Amino acid sequence: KFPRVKNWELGSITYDTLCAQSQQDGPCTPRRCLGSLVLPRPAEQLLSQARDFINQYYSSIKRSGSQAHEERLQEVEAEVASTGTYHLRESELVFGAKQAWRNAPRCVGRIQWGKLQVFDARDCSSAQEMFTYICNHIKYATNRGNLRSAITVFPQRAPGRGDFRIWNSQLVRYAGYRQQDGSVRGDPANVEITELCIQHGWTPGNGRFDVLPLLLQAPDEAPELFVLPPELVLEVPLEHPTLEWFAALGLRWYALPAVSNMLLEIGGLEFSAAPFSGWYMSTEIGTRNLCDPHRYNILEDVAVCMDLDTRTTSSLWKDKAAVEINLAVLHSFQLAKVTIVDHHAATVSFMKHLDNEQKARGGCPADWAWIVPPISGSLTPVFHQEMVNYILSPAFRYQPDPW
Amino acid sequence: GPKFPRVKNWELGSITYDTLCAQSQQDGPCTPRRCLGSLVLPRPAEQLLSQARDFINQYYSSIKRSGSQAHEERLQEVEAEVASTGTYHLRESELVFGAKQAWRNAPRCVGRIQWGKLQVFDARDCSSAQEMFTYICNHIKYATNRGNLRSAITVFPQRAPGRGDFRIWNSQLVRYAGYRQQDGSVRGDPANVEITELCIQHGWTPGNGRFDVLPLLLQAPDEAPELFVLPPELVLEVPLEHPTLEWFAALGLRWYALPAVSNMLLEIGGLEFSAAPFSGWYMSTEIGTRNLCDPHRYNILEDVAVCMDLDTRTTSSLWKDKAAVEINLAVLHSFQLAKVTIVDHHAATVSFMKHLDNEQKARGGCPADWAWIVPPISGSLTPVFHQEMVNYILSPAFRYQPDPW
Ligand code: HEM
Ligand code: HEM
Ligand SMILES: Cc1cc(N)nc(CCc2cncc(CCc3cc(C)cc(N)n3)c2)c1
Ligand SMILES: Cc1cc(N)nc(CCc2cncc(CCc3cc(C)cc(N)n3)c2)c1
Ligand SMILES: C[C@H](O)[C@H](O)[C@H]1CNc2nc(N)[nH]c(=O)c2N1
Ligand SMILES: C[C@H](O)[C@H](O)[C@H]1CNc2nc(N)[nH]c(=O)c2N1
Ligand SMILES: [Zn+2]
């Protein structure tokens, strides 16, 4: 019934009762845990989700069971009964979006969940307009390096008509150019989106860090290409506090992590284009982006620069280099005055978040494999913390590529 | 298409489906409503017969004699015995098979590529705590093999109806004392404060150091536990030093060569072996990262970073990470110098990938606990990090069992 959750470093125990609020099943069954998989494969439905969400709204403002609450419940009844769907009021949308971040079990930054700038772009009718809204988002969220978390919510989905979509997986992304030699110049994760941009008429560059254009799609239309004005995209040259040669590698990364391919579900309405951004955790760039073998794969290069025995796993040249790379990322960002959090600082804040949520809701959904950083896992206190995973709504969902 | 979990490796983009999980005859802690996959501890008439029937079938399959006369006769024999004594007994080769099979089946063990190479010492004749001591000494001798470590297990007599258990009170055959201090701190290993205290209560004269080898608390059926001291020539230890940081040897850190779990239950065809200590060789992260750096263990991260002249005042100097790497490097280096088997987390994980491929061929899946397979340092630097894994309970199995006190 109520799962007991232990911290093995401190011996402290809690119980999770938040999890009974889960209405949507996950991948696990008593027979097998699929906790580690990245993704598994009427108008009563929508009405109860809407009721439930409205309740969570009026409760959150301590106006639960009062008049405005009843008359807004009726408003929805009346809208679905007539049109099979309904619309949200701006502040309710502001509630959902925040709450969808709060509920994101794979997110280590949720201490921040309350601080979210929310742009209503539901009055969008063209890719043209989408681009404008996307551009104000980037400008707002960047703030010359003092990054501020934002979301922009484009118009909701609708029965028998195409979705508004952002084809790009993030708003700022580096091209992947499939070379003759079968190698990849640029970022390998983006080979395919790079190819679509080119198919839709973009003139490519030939560098390792070419900011990709956006492919924006308004309902039932071919997507349209838009180039991000290069002065909007803040970038950070990478260099190392003590290693003088690192900078020559000409390595760099963009300041703004902004997801743009995820669906936002609130009270049963679905928002198919609803990009959000906060700030980077250094390990995302220093460990995964630069060090994954199927990414920029810079480990060996760097270790050879460092002059390490590469001929053997037992010298730990991988672990040594990986650390220098992460350090170079932190230093560089801190030097260019651009918000970044290290994995130690981030997981410390996460632990306090678990605590706040414990008092606030009786738990916190959390995905241990995603919350523990890609290096030095057991050196952070999340490593020792048991965690319960489950789906609460409002939620972000993964959605399949629009092509 | 397939009616089974799909399993993807995100580095190579390769796909497999786990069909072995259909074999699982025991439920874990997850439900469709919520995943409890990271809990360390999750919360007989016909029953025995069917577990027994299943294991026998497993044994006859492994010898490619499924359906044969010896097979149905062994089944008949086992039923005859249960429907008479309420229990039954494994043949020698059945025990060797179930033991290897339990190691094969263990989701949390990264070292399973070695599963087929296990020395199984039978000790189901053992009848006193003195004799347990003897068996254990023999085991340690054999497994340590002067540094050239060899996987082994020693099986003591099974649970009986109306007879007490064989038990090794110690969680490991070799562990350091943890002495609770005047000032609240712990000298030694804080993991072992209780067992240390229990040893002194049962008569041990304690030492006063950070690395004192504990004595054994051994419990024959229905008796008080008797205390036994391992002769020091039997416990191989490695003094720790760094390849280049010269001051590291001056810390007087050290570890023992033989990781030997001693408190686990070994379940085979429903029979329960409450005392069946098993050992292999260390992966270097266990010593260098968990034992030496956990805040609730030796906790040497700060001492070392100070020596390294790092900025411990701020997180973003990655002082924790830099020191942790050296400590790990010193573990590897010192074991390698002293000629004691060890495997670094890179090589260990590569070979587990290879173990996954083999098992995919042989059984159609491999139960594995992601959070336990991925090493505590440099996680995504290892191929296991990008491998999805299905976790489920197969039997034969090893289970955690509560302390006997
Ligand atoms: C404010 C600073 C933030 C930090 C430091 C942070 C950190 C992270 C990290 C490290 C991940 C794992 C990323 C990976 O390995 O791919 C993640 C995932 C996630 N974050 Fe946060 N995040 C932040 C803000 C936000 C914001 C503003 C939102 C939404 C408004 C958000 C929603 C999510 C979601 C939905 C995921 C799941 C990723 C997926 O399934 O693709 N995060 N976050
Ligand atoms: C031969 C080299 C071996 C290596 C490198 C190895 C490695 C490991 C590691 C790193 C762990 C995680 C332990 C922890 O984090 O505390 C583990 C757990 C485990 N190992 Fe292995 N192991 C080896 C041999 C064996 C053998 C011979 C057996 C049994 C016959 C075994 C059975 C297990 C079991 C049952 C666990 C789970 C323990 C628990 O849940 O407490 N391993 N192993
Ligand atoms: C196949 C697949 C499934 C899935 N659920 N997510 C993804 C994308 C995962 C992913 C990859 N790179 C980047 C991110 C964004 C990470 C991110 C997001 C935010 C908002 C802040 C921050 N510091 N970091 C997410 C892929
Ligand atoms: C509460 C709890 C539950 C559980 N299942 N295990 C434990 C103890 C886990 C544990 C701690 N230190 C050490 C080990 C064994 C490590 C080990 C064992 C073997 C045989 C080889 C090898 N390389 N390493 C296991 C505690
Ligand atoms: C297969 C495995 O679940 C997958 O590689 C996960 C592991 N943990 C992760 N954790 C984070 N934060 N981000 C990731 O992309 C992943 N990848
Ligand atoms: C909370 C978490 O499940 C727990 O701390 C686990 C994580 N992974 C681990 N993995 C191994 N190999 N050993 C451990 O003790 C742990 N601890
Ligand atoms: Zn699970």
Side-chain angles (χ1 to χ4, degrees):
Chain A
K1 270 152 180 301
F2 302 110
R4 163 189 147 310
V5 188
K6 184 164 168 165
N7 181 292
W8 292 81
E9 175 198 339
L10 309 157
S12 79
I13 280 143
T14 65
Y15 287 97
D16 181 312
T17 86
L18 186 47
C19 69
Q21 298 313 314
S22 187
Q23 298 275 72
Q24 218 225 284
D25 302 303
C28 301
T29 74
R31 180 177 251 120
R32 79 283 168 297
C33 181
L34 265 14
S36 76
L37 310 205
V38 177
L39 42 100
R41 298 155 268 173
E44 285 192 352
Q45 228 99 18
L46 168 73
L47 190 103
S48 65
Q49 273 162 282
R51 268 185 144 266
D52 188 79
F53 164 78
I54 292 290
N55 293 330
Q56 301 187 54
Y57 175 75
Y58 278 85
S59 190
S60 99
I61 63 155
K62 295 292 159 91
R63 287 304 175 287
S64 215
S66 71
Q67 286 260 212
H69 185 214
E70 318 268 54
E71 285 178 357
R72 175 76 183 120
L73 264 140
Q74 290 161 13
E75 249 162 35
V76 174
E77 299 265 318
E79 213 157 325
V80 188
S82 273
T83 76
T85 190
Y86 75 116
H87 294 78
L88 299 168
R89 303 297 184 247
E90 168 172 25
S91 57
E92 299 171 344
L93 179 74
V94 164
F95 174 78
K98 282 167 174 155
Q99 210 70 27
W101 184 17
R102 196 187 186 167
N103 301 331
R106 295 183 165 166
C107 180
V108 76
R110 297 179 269 176
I111 192 81
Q112 272 300 135
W113 74 268
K115 198 141 185 267
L116 179 66
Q117 183 60 54
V118 172
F119 303 97
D120 193 349
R122 292 182 290 163
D123 76 319
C124 210
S125 87
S126 72
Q128 221 341 297
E129 292 169 11
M130 292 186 63
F131 182 52
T132 294
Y133 278 105
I134 287 186
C135 280
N136 292 114
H137 187 124
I138 293 156
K139 199 174 180 182
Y140 177 87
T142 313
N143 191 216
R144 282 107 113 276
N146 186 188
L147 277 41
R148 285 181 285 186
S149 319
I151 197 166
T152 299
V153 180
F154 287 107
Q156 70 207 53
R157 311 224 292 139
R161 87 99 162 88
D163 297 334
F164 281 88
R165 288 290 316 254
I166 299 167
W167 280 34
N168 298 70
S169 81
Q170 297 170 43
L171 299 178
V172 186
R173 293 253 81 186
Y174 296 131
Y177 303 119
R178 215 170 225 162
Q179 302 287 302
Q180 257 58 341
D181 9 276
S183 49
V184 187
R185 155 97 77 176
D187 185 333
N190 292 330
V191 137
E192 217 217 326
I193 187 69
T194 303
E195 256 138 359
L196 290 163
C197 293
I198 292 152
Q199 180 217 158
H200 284 90
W202 178 56
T203 301
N206 67 287
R208 322 172 60 181
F209 308 95
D210 288 317
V211 178
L212 277 167
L214 308 171
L215 271 170
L216 298 185
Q217 180 188 57
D220 307 300
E221 287 307 325
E224 280 182 50
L225 187 80
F226 300 83
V227 173
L228 289 168
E231 85 268 35
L232 277 211
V233 181
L234 184 52
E235 296 186 64
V236 174
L238 298 200
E239 61 166 60
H240 192 281
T242 57
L243 307 167
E244 83 265 30
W245 46 258
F246 197 98
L249 305 175
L251 259 36
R252 67 223 259 105
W253 207 258
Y254 52 84
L256 190 62
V259 181
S260 55
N261 65 174
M262 275 190 97
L263 185 150
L264 164 80
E265 179 268 309
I266 302 166
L269 301 178
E270 303 178 325
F271 292 85
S272 55
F276 55 87
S277 60
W279 56 78
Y280 264 122
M281 184 179 67
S282 54
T283 46
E284 298 175 75
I285 302 170
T287 299
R288 296 299 309 297
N289 291 353
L290 298 167
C291 293
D292 280 359
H294 54 296
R295 310 288 301 283
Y296 277 88
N297 192 231
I298 61 153
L299 227 33
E300 175 160 316
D301 285 322
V302 183
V304 161
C305 302
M306 286 188 64
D307 189 35
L308 306 169
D309 200 325
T310 250
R311 325 203 307 299
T312 180
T313 53
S314 29
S315 57
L316 307 192
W317 60 270
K318 295 193 177 183
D319 323 60
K320 275 167 165 179
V323 164
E324 293 325 290
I325 293 146
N326 279 85
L327 197 57
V329 151
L330 280 162
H331 166 83
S332 303
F333 270 68
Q334 288 158 358
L335 199 98
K337 282 306 179 74
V338 175
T339 322
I340 185 74
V341 73
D342 66 74
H343 50 285
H344 303 291
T347 56
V348 133
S349 72
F350 195 68
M351 293 301 306
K352 165 59 169 185
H353 181 65
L354 290 184
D355 195 75
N356 301 335
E357 296 297 81
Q358 195 51 53
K359 285 147 191 188
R361 292 207 287 181
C364 182
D367 193 318
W368 191 94
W370 279 60
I371 299 286
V372 178
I375 52 156
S376 291
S378 91
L379 275 28
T380 68
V382 293
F383 185 85
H384 306 274
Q385 175 64 59
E386 289 177 357
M387 295 173 189
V388 181
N389 198 1
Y390 47 93
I391 307 177
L392 303 178
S393 173
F396 294 110
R397 290 207 302 261
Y398 185 81
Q399 69 183 307
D401 285 20
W403 64 86
Chain B
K3 204 201 101 287
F4 302 91
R6 188 260 244 164
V7 187
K8 172 154 177 191
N9 171 294
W10 288 85
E11 184 195 328
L12 312 152
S14 59
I15 297 307
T16 61
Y17 293 86
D18 181 313
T19 53
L20 170 66
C21 67
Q23 286 314 283
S24 174
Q25 291 294 192
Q26 204 177 152
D27 301 345
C30 302
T31 60
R33 273 204 183 84
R34 89 276 184 276
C35 176
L36 258 21
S38 68
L39 304 206
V40 175
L41 299 166
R43 270 346 302 181
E46 322 112 20
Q47 184 73 309
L48 217 196
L49 226 41
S50 59
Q51 283 188 259
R53 279 187 196 102
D54 172 80
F55 171 75
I56 298 308
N57 290 352
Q58 271 182 61
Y59 173 70
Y60 283 88
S61 281
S62 91
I63 67 166
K64 306 295 132 73
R65 290 293 177 280
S66 232
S68 72
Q69 189 162 300
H71 182 197
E72 317 276 301
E73 280 181 18
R74 185 44 182 155
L75 281 166
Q76 285 183 307
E77 169 166 57
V78 147
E79 297 166 355
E81 221 195 331
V82 183
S84 184
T85 72
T87 198
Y88 80 107
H89 304 286
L90 305 180
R91 307 229 249 249
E92 166 189 282
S93 51
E94 299 175 345
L95 181 67
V96 172
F97 167 78
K100 292 168 180 163
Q101 211 66 2
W103 179 17
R104 200 197 187 156
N105 291 348
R108 288 178 167 167
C109 186
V110 80
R112 282 170 287 164
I113 201 175
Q114 291 297 156
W115 75 268
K117 223 230 254 83
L118 181 64
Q119 187 57 42
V120 167
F121 299 110
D122 200 343
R124 298 179 293 158
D125 60 0
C126 191
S127 97
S128 87
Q130 164 56 74
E131 189 174 16
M132 293 180 80
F133 179 53
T134 295
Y135 271 115
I136 288 159
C137 284
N138 293 5
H139 179 125
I140 287 159
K141 263 204 265 163
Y142 179 90
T144 299
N145 190 26
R146 287 204 325 280
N148 179 24
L149 274 41
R150 299 179 289 215
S151 291
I153 185 184
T154 297
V155 187
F156 292 102
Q158 67 208 43
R159 254 218 217 8
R163 204 250 282 117
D165 287 346
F166 275 90
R167 282 304 305 262
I168 308 170
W169 285 35
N170 308 52
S171 64
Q172 278 182 54
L173 290 185
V174 182
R175 293 246 81 182
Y176 297 118
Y179 311 118
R180 183 154 285 293
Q181 292 291 296
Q182 198 113 154
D183 35 278
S185 65
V186 182
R187 183 157 175 72
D189 188 332
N192 303 322
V193 147
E194 247 209 306
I195 193 73
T196 307
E197 275 170 20
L198 283 167
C199 288
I200 295 161
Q201 259 182 220
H202 283 99
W204 181 51
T205 287
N208 206 356
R210 301 171 82 191
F211 301 102
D212 292 329
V213 186
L214 278 171
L216 261 17
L217 246 15
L218 306 176
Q219 162 164 89
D222 292 332
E223 268 180 329
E226 293 184 77
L227 177 98
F228 296 93
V229 195
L230 300 144
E233 52 264 56
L234 261 69
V235 190
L236 182 63
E237 294 194 284
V238 186
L240 284 185
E241 55 160 74
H242 199 268
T244 48
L245 303 173
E246 267 165 3
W247 46 255
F248 195 103
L251 278 353
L253 308 174
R254 66 203 272 121
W255 212 258
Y256 53 87
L258 190 67
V261 172
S262 55
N263 69 162
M264 290 196 90
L265 182 136
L266 165 64
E267 176 269 320
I268 294 170
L271 296 181
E272 283 159 318
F273 298 97
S274 63
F278 59 87
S279 65
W281 53 78
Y282 269 113
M283 181 169 79
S284 66
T285 56
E286 305 170 77
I287 305 165
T289 307
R290 297 309 311 292
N291 309 353
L292 291 184
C293 302
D294 276 359
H296 51 289
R297 297 287 299 290
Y298 282 89
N299 195 207
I300 69 153
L301 223 40
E302 220 203 43
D303 292 329
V304 172
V306 164
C307 298
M308 294 184 76
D309 180 45
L310 306 171
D311 192 8
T312 51
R313 260 92 64 102
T314 178
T315 54
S316 71
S317 80
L318 304 198
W319 63 269
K320 260 146 154 161
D321 317 73
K322 297 162 111 164
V325 175
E326 302 315 328
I327 289 148
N328 282 275
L329 176 55
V331 169
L332 281 150
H333 178 69
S334 306
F335 270 69
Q336 280 169 183
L337 196 69
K339 324 242 64 42
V340 177
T341 307
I342 185 129
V343 64
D344 70 82
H345 46 295
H346 301 283
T349 58
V350 162
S351 71
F352 180 78
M353 295 312 290
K354 176 58 187 205
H355 172 75
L356 291 173
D357 182 275
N358 296 351
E359 289 292 83
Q360 195 54 42
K361 256 135 251 222
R363 282 211 295 191
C366 180
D369 191 347
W370 195 90
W372 274 71
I373 292 300
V374 169
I377 51 160
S378 297
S380 74
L381 266 40
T382 69
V384 293
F385 181 95
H386 316 283
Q387 181 53 60
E388 291 167 359
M389 306 185 179
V390 190
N391 190 208
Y392 47 95
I393 299 169
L394 291 191
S395 165
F398 289 111
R399 329 161 177 164
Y400 174 96
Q401 56 175 346
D403 305 302
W405 59 84

